[model samples]
Target: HTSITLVAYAVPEPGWSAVIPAFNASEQGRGVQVITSYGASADQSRGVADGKPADLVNFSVEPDIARLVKAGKVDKDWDADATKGIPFGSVVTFVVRAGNPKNIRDWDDLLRPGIEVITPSPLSSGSAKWNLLAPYAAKSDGGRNNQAGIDFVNTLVNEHVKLRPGSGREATDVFVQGSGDVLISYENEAIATERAGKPVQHVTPPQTFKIENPLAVVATSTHLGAATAFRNFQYTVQAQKLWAQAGFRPVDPAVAADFADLFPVPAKLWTIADLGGWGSVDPQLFD
Candidate 1:
């Protein structure tokens, strides 16, 4: 039996716990352990670069994996595999109280004064960082107008913001405790919380961020076979269906149908590309 270590940007308590069961069911999955590090994409990339013994790394963005490729820790031709750009297992989204007390409708509302926002520290949470950039990118693609989005996030962080230590899970906790009017988190996390009968509610903004999470095998992995198998399984119809049932956006056509209502917007409604690709975004923006 081969033992493969799985490292990812998933927050410990709710987010990672919620997804672990499904991952463990895979044939290639032997032992799955999670380390709660903040910053999904950046941490994952840094781990691989520093030789952190991760056979497989699941990050919130593709650019981190691309960095691994540049560092020769991942194959340059990785995109040709069955996983196809990291399987896109899930997405990040916002969480609010039941009835949306703030009357928040779109990203613009986040900028309004006096609206408290709860999110993980971008320095530690990759999803939080992406959540911060997505709105700015959507305002007007890559241009000066995007500054509106940037300014809004800065203001939100500056006023009425509670910085959490962990990733999405920490932000979720703050929202559950009534710490803020809005909480930016993972879509699956919102669904899990709602299912648990939390007073919090979630909104799918008319213009929301595309929460496409990707996974990849570390080139330096000693358990290459297990890592490759696990990555491939994530894209299979079976795995995709399982992920969708768990409240994620399944890339597979078969699994996507099961969660049609979960994703109300059209495909073209938004995309990650509009956010100036993770690689191009200023690292200082998150700090």
Candidate 2:
């Protein structure tokens, strides 16, 4: 049996937890065990750049993978895959109390005075960045209004946002503990909470960003064969079909539509590609 260290940003919890057991029990088990560690996306990326023992790394953002490609720990053309390295995806959605307290329904509503928000730390968490971008990108409302969007993010970061946990899971816990009025979280996180019997209501904003988590085999990995095979499993029907059971949106049309009722789509959706990809966002948001 070969053990591969797969470093990841949050969202794998229970999901990978279930997948691993099923994989090991399958006919094609291969005696392969995916030993895993979790952290915020930035930290996970740093681990690979710093040469930590990672046979594969899954990040909450495409840019996180691109960061390694630039660091030479991963090839520059790492996204040369069918789904462009995004095996599964989720979107930034608002989790509010069951009654929809504060009547918070859209991005602007988050700024209504006295509304406390919970998001993971952007410095360390990948979803934090996505949470921020969701409303920021939607500021355009599918229009070209850039400054208005920037101002909205500024108000959210400075005035509304509070309790930025180290990871999305931590933020979810905080929300469940009744610490915040609202939690900006991945669709899967909210769904998982519901599946666990926690009654919480989440809303799809008027416009929201698509949160695509990227997966790639480690460039300097010794267990390259094992890592590559495991990575490929993510895009397969066997794995993707199970991903939905864990509350993720599968890339396969058949698999995704089967669970479509779990999390309905927003009227308007946007991607980083709409804003010129990470090339435009990296420098604007980070540097």
Top-scoring candidate (lDDT): 2
Q: What lDDT score is found at residue 265 in candidate 2?
A: 83
Cα deviation at 74, candidate 2, in Å, is 2.0
Off by over 4 Å in 1: 11-41, 89-92, 141-144, 162-166, 266-268, 282-287
- 127-219 in candidate 1: lDDT tens per residue? 776677656555645435766666766676777575664567667776798787888777777888998899877875555667767677778
C-alpha RMSD of candidate 2: 1.8
lDDT of 2 by residue, 78-195 (tens): 6876688888888889998888967988888889889998988878888898898888788855338988788888888789776769889889888898888889999888888877
* lDDT of model number 1: 0.67
Flag clash pairs in model 2. none
Number of the top TM-score candidate: 2
